[PDB]
Amino acid sequence: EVETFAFQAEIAQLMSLIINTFYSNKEIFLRELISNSSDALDKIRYESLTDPSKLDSGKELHINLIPNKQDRTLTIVDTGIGMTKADLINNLGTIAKSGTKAFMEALQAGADISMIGQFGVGFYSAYLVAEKVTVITKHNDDEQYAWESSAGGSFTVRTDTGEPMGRGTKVILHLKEDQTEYLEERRIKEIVKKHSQFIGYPITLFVEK
């Protein structure tokens, strides 16, 4: 059972701008996704300070980066708070309508795409490098769901029958053919060191056979 939804017009416009604007500094997508993971880990940590059972679904608070050259995917995994089905549908837990409005006003006023995270819509920078994004998520208060979009104005949500996650979010980037540098260990290490050096959770870069 797959449900297909239309993006709000403003979010579709944000995604088309990200896909179509000439902008060479694409590597910032990874900083934005890691920042979102850190924010989600902060939320479950805060909840656990008054209710330790919030971590019954997993005590470890971490971020994993998993490149797969055979599938041409880069996956960002975190054990943060996750997202309910309602959160997924409501722009992955963001205020993306008002954030897009502010972002595009900033762009016409001199800003560049790298400042997207200051407007709460950094997730959509994934489309700088990915032709399709799949988001698998599990929140303590809901079941495990898969969101997916290749842009083009629509996204899908379905219950996920894949590997149970316990709690957290996996962002699977199906990379564009010309963006495979983001599967190379030395390139990922460079970006993490440049942009994510002060993230307060362990970031483990997995290696491949």
Return the SS3 of 65: strand
Which region among 12-20, 35-43, 48-56, 195-203 touches ligand A1AXD (by CB under 6 A)? Answer: 35-43
Binding residue per annotation — 176? no
Residue 149: its H or E element: strand 145-149
Q: Can you say how many angstroms the Cα of residue 156 is from the centroid of all Cα atoms in its chain?
A: 16
156: enclosing H helix or E strand: strand 154-159
* 92 binds ligand A1AXD per the rule CB under 6 A: yes
Rounded Cα distance between 128 and 28, Å, is 9
- Extract the tokens encoding 164: 């149970």
Nearer to ligand A1AXD, 27 or 78 (CB): 78
CA separation for the pair 162, 92 (Å, rounded): 20
Which span sits near ligand A1AXD by CB under 6 A: 88-96, 98-106, 107-115, 178-186? 88-96
Any contact of residue 173 with ligand A1AXD (CB under 6 A)?
A: no
Query: And the tokens for 188?
Result: 């990922």
In angstroms, rounded to a whole number, what is the distance separating the alpha carbons of residues 95 and 155?
A: 17
Binding mask 152-171 for ligand A1AXD (x = CB under 6 A): -----------------x--
In this structure, the number of other CB atoms found within 10 A of the CB of residue 111 comes to 16
Of 11, 26, 37, 138, the one binding ligand A1AXD by CB under 6 A: 37
Contact region with ligand A1AXD (CB under 6 A), list: 11-19, 34-42, 148-156, 194-202: 34-42
Residue 84 interacts with ligand A1AXD (CB under 6 A): yes or no:
no
Query: Count residues contacting ligand A1AXD (CB under 6 A)?
Result: 11
Question: Segment contacting ligand A1AXD (CB under 6 A): 33-41, 111-119, 176-184, 197-205?
Answer: 33-41
The edge-to-edge listing of strands for the beta sheet with 154-159 is 2-6, 154-159, 145-149, 130-138, 168-175, 73-78, 63-68, 203-205
Is residue 108 within 8 A of residue 22, CB to CB? The reply is no
**Residue 51 is assigned to a ligand binding site:** no
Known binding residues for ATP: 36, 78, 97, 123
| Interaction site with ligand A1AXD (CB under 6 A) | 36-37, 40, 78, 80, 83, 92-94, 123, 169
Q: Binding site, residues?
A: 36, 78, 97, 123
